[PDB]
Design a protein around this ligand. Structure first.
Ligand SMILES: CC(=O)N[C@@H]1[C@@H](O)[C@H](O[C@@H]2O[C@H](CO)[C@H](O)[C@H](O[C@H]3O[C@H](CO)[C@H](O)[C@H](O)[C@H]3NC(C)=O)[C@H]2O[C@@H]2O[C@@H](C)[C@@H](O)[C@@H](O)[C@@H]2O)[C@@H](CO)O[C@H]1O
Ligand SMILES: CC(=O)N[C@@H]1[C@@H](O)[C@H](O[C@@H]2O[C@H](CO)[C@H](O)[C@H](O[C@H]3O[C@H](CO)[C@H](O)[C@H](O)[C@H]3NC(C)=O)[C@H]2O[C@@H]2O[C@@H](C)[C@@H](O)[C@@H](O)[C@@H]2O)[C@@H](CO)O[C@H]1O
Lengths: 163, 155
């Protein structure tokens, strides 16, 4: 065959849950996490640190995106299976990254081979140089066993077979 | 030398159009998100070129029970229709929302409803998409506002 066939896959990921991808994400592909909520409140009941993750088949964290309200930073990192975290990249001021977001948000990751480009709504927040390479085979959503900055269910959409 | 891609988000009301800040070209994607599924009069989602050609017209026709795909030049007649039968069957397990994705593959538009490819549409007019539109009679099959997301600067 000569024509290009791409694919859309849709996943509902609860806080504290993971999904295995039916179509892996590789160079040229995209994943967007859609949240139907955004909670940036301080004080009692304030959200715990909340992460969205792209994992390889052996459980490496290819990209970990940790939104830390109290510390007021977004941390980007990677981690081999059963190993220490690698070198963090940080973006300061969580709320500033969600200006004009309203009551929902999206976090998009482009796999560009050597880098992951992360875009919050329309704003590129990092061109992250990869610390671990390879295909993404699962996604996960960690709210430190408690209150999340996002909706209880986040919808992940993958666009694959692009290249 | 690095690739910089872009996400753009548009809120398109029924009977409205939006100009794209970043045009959709070969390798790019547009997804239309509806927060309702009303399965209502004929409803269309359109990709238009700078000169007002309909590069892709997607018409959902509930009563006729078909989805019609076509193109047309500015100020000119419609071209050759491609049809997909049974509208509801394309939205199996959709619930109360839906998404319609168009991949610009250069020679074809691949249209995917939720996860299901419904057509590999052979282009009848080529070129970049510079605007989107959403047509209906309050009788749309989709929500009054549809959110379009474009992914551009891919290739
Ligand atoms: C200034 C500085 O360098 N600080 C470092 C901290 O940021 C490190 O904290 C960990 O950072 C990781 C990313 O680099 C990651 O976010 C991790 O939390 C996540 O992973 C752990 C297991 O390692 C747990 O599973 C957590 O639940 C999980 N959290 C989320 C939201 O996904 C961070 O570690 C946790 O948070 C910090 C603040 C401490 O409370 C730790 O005890 C927690 O485990 C830190 C360790 O790499 O190193 C510092 O130097
Ligand atoms: C079997 C066959 O060939 N049938 C043909 C019909 O499908 C043709 O209907 C038009 O089809 C067009 C795509 O090929 C297009 O969907 C069009 O409607 C759209 O464009 C018109 C202007 O031309 C209006 O702007 C409509 O509002 C717009 N529709 C939407 C949803 O945005 C179709 O024409 C309309 O719908 C049909 C069913 C009739 O009611 C027409 O009078 C309407 O104008 C048809 C005409 O090209 O030719 C048949 O042979």
């Amino acid at each position: 065959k000569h024509m290009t066939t791409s694919a859309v896959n849709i996943y509902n990921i609860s806080a504290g849950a993971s999904v295995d991808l039916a179509a892996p994400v590789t160079t040229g592909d995209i994943v967007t996490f859609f949240s139907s909520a955004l909670n940036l409140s301080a004080g009692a009941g304030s959200p715990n640190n909340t992460a969205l993750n792209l994992l390889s088949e052996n459980g490496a964290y290819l990209l970990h995106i940790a939104f830390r309200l109290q510390e007021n930073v977004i941390v980007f990192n990677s981690r081999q299976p059963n190993a220490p975290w690698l070198v963090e990249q940080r973006v300061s001021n969580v709320a500033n990254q969600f200006i004009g977001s309203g009551g929902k948000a999206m976090v998009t990751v482009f796999d560009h081979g050597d880098k992951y480009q992360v875009v919050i709504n329309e704003k590129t927040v990092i061109q992250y140089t990869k610390q671990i390479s390879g295909t993404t085979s699962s996604l996960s959503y960690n709210s430190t066993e408690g209150t999340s900055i996002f909706s209880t269910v986040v919808e992940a959409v993958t666009y694959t077979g692009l290249a």
